[model samples]
Target: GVKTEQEDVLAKELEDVNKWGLHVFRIAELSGNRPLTVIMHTIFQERDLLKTFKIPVDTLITYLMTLEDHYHADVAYHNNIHAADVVQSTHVLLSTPALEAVFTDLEILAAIFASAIHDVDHPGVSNQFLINTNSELALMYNDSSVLENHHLAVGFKLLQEENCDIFQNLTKKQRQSLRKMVIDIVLATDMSKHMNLLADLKTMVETKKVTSSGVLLLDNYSDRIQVLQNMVHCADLSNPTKPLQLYRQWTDRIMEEFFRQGDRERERGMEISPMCDKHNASVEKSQVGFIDYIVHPLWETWADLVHPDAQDILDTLEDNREWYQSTNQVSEFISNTFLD
Candidate 1:
């Protein structure tokens, strides 16, 4: 197991002291076999986790604290904590029984690291915001996966610092492999990649191919890449499988953040993501829209790959769907507005 008693004890103590509790710690524990210290220490060594990259964990914590202070509300739902959760989820997904033999340590490292830094300094806006507003990230990425590209570049740039060089010990070839793997995995986090990535994953699983060693073989680069792509996707959508209380907490945070983004967009006279438009109609309907359009399809594909392993997650998602549907119906009736 990546997490141990030491990590668990420390997490419990922290949970007692803070509202965010041991959430981050639990995420780290669940994500990988490495001890929390080891993971944190590794991240701390990466120069990108520092000021240069602008997404350094310390900077992220400070920024999130400021957001919390200004908003006079929780910022745990923001980029920093959300990124940690996804990374942790990615870690746990990698630990699945079917993937153990097929994935390499370097790949796992890349996947986990990519998750940690995927959405630093998100500004509660989408890539479309960058494009519409001519934001630097959008310009830098040429209006293509603006956030994802920026995140990868900034994350790797931070690694230039000697102390934060998590991959400093690797040989040249190892560094090359790790870098490539990390880049591919991080890029896949872009929402734009969702459809193609899931489609490819389904294809690969359907083929049910194997290597000579009697293990699932990813002999070709594309095949290898596809598996990792889905791995991160699975991690990204990992919320439902989480313990119900924790899952609900995450849902609340994400919805709050999305609503906040909606509010910001309105203030700026920008078009809002469908769910972000909090005042447009029923909140429940908006959420159901989000789940149906964004959340469900992603999870459906993932469930197909893992099947029985993801049964609990599927059940939770279905339950959540029903919860939203029923709630929305009641709310709609009270408001005298019916939603299809």
Candidate 2:
């Protein structure tokens, strides 16, 4: 009885996650800091992935629990809530009418799985920072997709343990396919890959193909995996495109994480990273620049591929950008009038 009640409560809280603009920070609070497992369980169950894939309930729970625990809870930006947010966002991205039924169930599972574990055990610093400090991850991955490589390795390694093998029922071929797809999708989340991924997505849009009923036609593994990678990448970057308040919360978390890394760098007599100088930071200005140069371009092309499906997302992003810009102007005017 108690279990059912708790499940009902979490299910109710997770209802908003199906939408494009979920307030995941609120869910983090309401879910008692267990947002990752709750969201994953709900999304998997809601999608009928468990039945479709024959994943036992306890096994899924065990896998998600360990996965969520692996995410450094102390890291504000890359914690489990961020994982949950990305997972929910990936679900929304795949739900677009233009892409409906375009991806197979295995593909969907891989995308969600990739999103959920994309940033597991993040150390709250950039790969460049890790390399600069000669961190073990950078050395292990040879300064190439260091964090991404570590996340994939650690996330998958957890599956080898007893009772955590959620894919136990899958055939060897199915497991292999899922593993490859998951790796491709997760590695694409590395920021260094952003421009290249966006370029490929732009090319796909230029030579877009569709079915008679207007669904996407991804004929090859490369094309299919590329789009899936973009979806997870989009979800990874979707914070700026969300409702402004939620976007602000994400900015806060990331800035805090960046600030901490900067503090560590300073202590070691290293050069301060950009946006890491808290005393010199203008939050609104940085956000406006980020949206203009990074967020807007990717989302714009994505809207083109999906046509009107993502228009609302683009509009929200534009509105948020405007809000940031206007706030910057007001603060600048105040400095000119009074502080100057």
Candidate 3:
């Protein structure tokens, strides 16, 4: 299992620090006591947090740190820290009462790690960009979730480092399970996979099947895969549940990143993604579109996963959606009459 040792090397490199779980504290320090660290660590270290997940905490931390390095060098707002945030959120979602019994330790580990590495080396562009421009990622993955597949590959490649092999301790069977779970979860993060995955999740929830112990029974491989898929999707769209201040910060950052991508699209003679087109677009409107088209449906299905346990989160998401919609109307009026 020592297929890669970089993570081990990284952990040893930072062994002196008091915090060694997943670099949240280190990143929080870097962000000037920003609420991100507190929020993330609070969720990750919660008492019932996937303690049995067999993953070496240090290995996860090292892999996360490496992922951070990849993002620091790539796109604007979408970076390693965002990945860490999503992973933390995934942990929170797993803690929901409905999910508590259905998922095993391996599933939790896969979901968390998949979130942390989902956007590795993103170039501030969409899957369509690769398809349109014939980019290397598109070619490598045959235009099939190009970016998502690349992210997964890069994440696993990073693990090749002897020290960073978070899965190093897994037996062959465990490793096989971990690999399948991680791949499915990561691939499900692709927006293209959004509708199908959510549909399957909703169907599963409707079935309401349970084991004799009364926990949701995921006795089959299909059931297990469906649950993990939705788990990661929920993590990807968790920003709405974030504190208002932090949510706004993320909004600004993602917009800046998207607009920058729009600018590049214009330069390269490529069509811009709906939210990325900045010249004639209202940022607020684009956000509303994003929430309506991408964020809302995904979160709504996830809320279904845990039912009443996710009530507060659902409330927050609705509140944020309404706020964005209102803000967009005002921006549109202003842009049409004055700015244009």
TM-score of every candidate relative to the true structure: 0.73, 0.93, 0.79
Candidate 2 residue lDDT tens string, 20-103: 877787777777788898889988988999999999999999999999999998898999999999999999999999998888
Q: Highest lDDT, which number?
A: 2
Q: Give a tens-digit lDDT track for model 1, residues 1-340.
A: 5758776665454332212123563543443422233333334343233333333454444433332222212354644456655654665666565555777656666676667666655666667766888888888789877877877776667665444555545678977887788788878877666767767877877876645543465777788777777777666766654555676777777667767877887888876655555666565665566567656777776666655566666677777767867985323322221111
Q: Total clashing residue pairs per candidate?
A: 11, 0, 13
User: For every candidate structure, what is the RMSD over all alpha carbons to the true structure, in angstroms?
Assistant: 8.4, 5.5, 8.0
Q: Model 3 over residues 1-340: C-alpha lDDT tens digits?
A: 5724544544342332222123443444444333232333334455334255455677655655665667654454667557666766677677666655677766766777677778878887777776888888888889787888999899889997756776676789977988888898888777656667767877887776765543566778888888878877777767656655667777787778878877888898876665566666676666666667666777776666556676777777778778878875434422332221
- True-vs-predicted CA distance for residue 284, candidate 1, Å: 2.5
Ranking by lDDT: 2, 3, 1
Q: What is the overall TM-score of model 1 with all chains considered together? A: 0.73
Query: What lDDT score goes with residue 10 in model 1?
Result: 51
Per-candidate local distance difference test: 0.60, 0.87, 0.66
Deviation in angstroms for 112 in model 2?
Answer: 0.4
Off by over 4 Å in 3: 1-61, 210-214, 328-340
Two-way TM-score contest, 1 vs 2, winner:
2
Model 1: per-residue Cα lDDT at residue 116: 67
- Report the lDDT of model 3 for residue 300: 75
Give the CA lDDT, 0 to 100, for residue 2 in model 3: 70
- Those runs of model 2 whose alpha carbons end farther than 4 Å from true positions after fitting are 2-9, 328-340
